[PDB]
């Protein structure tokens, strides 16, 4: 204790002396930089398709890089590889656990990834030599519950837990290369950056940590949210990220300022928000509530630009595809709507 | 050119057919979700009911069940629990001769019970252990008022139906107990779910048809409650 | 930063009092439900009690009723806990752990071993 006090007051002073540096470089707002632009104005989506088919939940998904094919889980046990254009379903995988929460469509589209509960981010082959699909391999050793495993490539994939531990994969070997610790809470959400250099994932204590992929170390961590960090998207140009949480409040972070940028919150919204995105300019911020509801933000002037109300149950998941074509939605009442 | 187009629709119809068969399979089945402490007792329901997350099926009158336990976590369970929110009914065992943990499973009742995402979920309560509560009763070793003060001022209710040979010192501390969980239940969710309370041992042989008759009960209040009638 | 400052907690002869203080900062103290939990020498986290949004919920542990009384200032940023007839048997580390959402009345895992939204926590120590 009389040693172990000088430990808390390192770690005081600092993390005091942080701050400061950080106050420094905040001279003005991003509202009064961005408050000379006109506003986009009102953003009116439209409902194009809605897939059915899910019997439970849906309660994540991932486009594809070709912007046509879907992946999405349900708390049934089903992992549906839909088709956008012709609403056809092209795959649907039987899961060994039902209650899988996370999936994720490999870019050269030849593996898709789920897991939940299980503690397994099963790799499964769509492009098999008899055609069918089966678990390729099953990565096994988290602790916790995996909540997001996304394919850095091919033969690497990079895990979420619930046992407060992000970890990199190989998928040839099924072993830990890079073990990712830090974070206090569950870990919720991960973004890639577009280079798939480095990474940011929020978790369950009001935080963010952005990871570099090739060293494992955490390079910094961002606060300002209230409640546990539910999701986590990176910018188009990958020098910042948005971050939604319980407070029912958006916050965009910027990498090299190394602060909070912006804040996305109205009075009228006081639930939890469980899905975010940019669109491929990256001046709309998608974001998924718990009121049934999704919210365009003007991510610039921090003004609700549309609404996308389509849902009869809370909306679990959003997704842009790469083109920024359209944008989809899966929610608790077992529908995948598409809208642009 | 349009052979694909007709390999594609062809291939959804074959998805379409399966889906439709694995709907019968998942809507007969009854999702359980067992949810219980160390000392609760869980296991010992889990072994003798003999038909990252342990299953178990058992089949009680040509009706599929399936008992969700969930220990391969850590010990918070906000993030997870919201995956239950669509179960048959949630399990809560409690050990009634821990007094000094008897607290901590009130907490955790009144937390499932006033869920955003679990009000709509019905608990079948099984306050195990019953012979363990006899004889810390009647020791005389440990008493409820230490913990629980309302307990010196607590009277039998009348519609108690004990065992048969029973010290009615032993029954009014069992239904207060009881009562503690049953408090929790009636001050919210008003008509949309409820609790099923069981006073259980470690060798009550069948405990199974107490879940059939509950999980039966559960589905006829929710088909009397979209007729309005309930 | 979420951070919540315990104060007060000490040396105290049985019979006495005690008036623990939580200072709350980098969030909105009015919206979240307010805990008071304690770890005891050689035993696990034990809640103690809780108050609501507003001040209206006031429920405790039941070994601490009539004892413990737990206060609420939403304009101070501040919580309070005054205990009046301290036994050997509370002897232990008080924390103030907040509840994870902002809206809610039901509180989950504030007694967990590593909860993010609990402080330090204070001494208290009670011995002849």
């Known amino acids: 204790q009389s040693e172990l006090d000088q430990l808390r007051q390192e770690a005081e002073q600092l993390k005091n002396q942080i701050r400061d540096a950080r106050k420094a470089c905040a001279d003005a707002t991003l509202s009064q930089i961005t408050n000379n632009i006109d506003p986009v104005g009102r953003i009116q989506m439209r409902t194009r398709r809605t897939l059915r088919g899910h019997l439970a939940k849906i309660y994540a998904m991932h486009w594809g890089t070709d912007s046509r094919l879907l992946v999405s889980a349900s708390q049934d046990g089903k992992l549906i590889i839909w088709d956008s254009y012709t609403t056809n379903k092209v795959h649907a995988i039987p899961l060994r656990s039902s209650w899988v929460m996370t999936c994720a469509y490999a870019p050269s589209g030849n593996y898709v990834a789920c897991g939940g509960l299980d503690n397994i981010c099963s790799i499964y082959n769509l492009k098999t030599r008899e055609g069918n699909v089966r678990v390729s391999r099953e990565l096994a050793g988290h602790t916790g519950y995996l909540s997001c495993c996304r394919f850095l490539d091919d033969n690497q994939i990079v895990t979420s837990s619930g046992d407060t531990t992000c970890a990199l994969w190989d998928i040839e070997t099924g072993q830990q290369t890079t073990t990712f610790t830090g974070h206090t809470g569950d870990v919720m959400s991960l973004s890639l950056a577009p280079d798939t250099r480095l990474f940011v994932s929020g978790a369950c204590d009001a935080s963010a940590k952005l990871w570099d992929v090739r060293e494992g170390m955490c390079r910094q961590t961002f606060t300002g949210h209230e409640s546990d960090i539910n999701a986590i998207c990176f910018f188009p140009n990958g020098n910042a990220f948005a971050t939604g949480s319980d407070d029912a409040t958006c916050r965009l972070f910027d990498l090299r300022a190394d602060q909070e940028l912006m804040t996305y919150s109205h009075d009228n919204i006081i639930c939890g928000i469980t899905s975010v995105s940019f669109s491929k300019s990256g001046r709309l911020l998608l974001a998924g509530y718990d009121d049934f509801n999704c919210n365009v933000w003007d991510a610039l002037k921090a003004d609700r630009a549309g609404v996308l109300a389509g849902h009869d149950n809370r909306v679990s998941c959003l997704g842009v595809t790469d083109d920024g074509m359209a944008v989809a939605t899966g929610s608790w009442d077992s529908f995948l709507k598409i809208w642009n | 050119q349009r052979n694909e187009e007709k390999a594609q629709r062809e291939a959804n119809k074959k998805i379409e057919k399966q889906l439709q068969k694995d709907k019968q399979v998942y809507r007969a089945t009854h999702r359980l979700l067992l949810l219980g402490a160390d000392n609760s007792g869980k296991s010992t329901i889990v072994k003798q009911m003999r038909i990252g997350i342990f299953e178990t099926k058992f089949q009680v009158d040509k009706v599929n069940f399936h008992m969700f336990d969930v220990g391969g976590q850590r010990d918070e369970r906000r993030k997870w629990i919201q995956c239950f929110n669509d179960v048959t009914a949630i399990i809560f065992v409690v050990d009634s001769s821990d007094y000094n943990r008897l607290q901590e499973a009130l907490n955790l009742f009144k937390s499932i019970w006033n869920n955003r995402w679990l009000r709509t979920i019905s608990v079948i309560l099984f306050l195990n252990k019953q012979d363990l509560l006899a004889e810390k009763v009647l020791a005389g070793k440990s008493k409820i008022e230490d913990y629980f003060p309302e307990f010196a001022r607590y009277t039998t209710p009348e519609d108690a139906t004990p065992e048969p040979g029973e010290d009615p010192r032993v029954t009014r501390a069992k239904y207060f107990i009881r009562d503690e969980f049953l408090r929790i239940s009636t001050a919210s969710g008003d008509g949309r779910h409820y609790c099923y309370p069981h006073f259980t041992c470690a060798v009550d042989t069948e405990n199974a048809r107490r879940i059939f008759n509950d999980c039966r009960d559960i589905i006829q209040r929710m088909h009397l409650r979209q007729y309005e009638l309930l | 930063q979420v951070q919540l400052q315990e104060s007060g907690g000490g040396l105290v002869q049985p019979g006495g009092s005690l008036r623990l203080s939580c200072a709350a900062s980098?969030?909105?103290?009015?919206?979240?439900?307010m805990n008071w939990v304690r770890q005891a020498p050689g035993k696990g986290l034990e809640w103690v009690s809780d108050i609501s949004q507003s001040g209206a919920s006031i429920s405790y542990t039941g070994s601490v009723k009539g004892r413990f009384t737990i206060s609420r200032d939403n304009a101070k940023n501040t919580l309070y806990l005054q205990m009046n007839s301290l036994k050997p048997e509370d002897t232990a580390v008080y924390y103030c752990?907040?509840?994870?959402?902002?809206?809610?009345?039901?509180?989950?895992?504030?007694?967990?071993?590593?909860?993010?939204?609990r402080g330090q926590g204070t001494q208290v120590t009670v011995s002849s």
């Open positions: 980098g969030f909105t103290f009015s919206n979240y439900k």
């Open positions: 752990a907040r509840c994870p959402a902002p809206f809610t009345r039901d509180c989950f895992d504030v007694t967990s071993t590593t909860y993010a939204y």
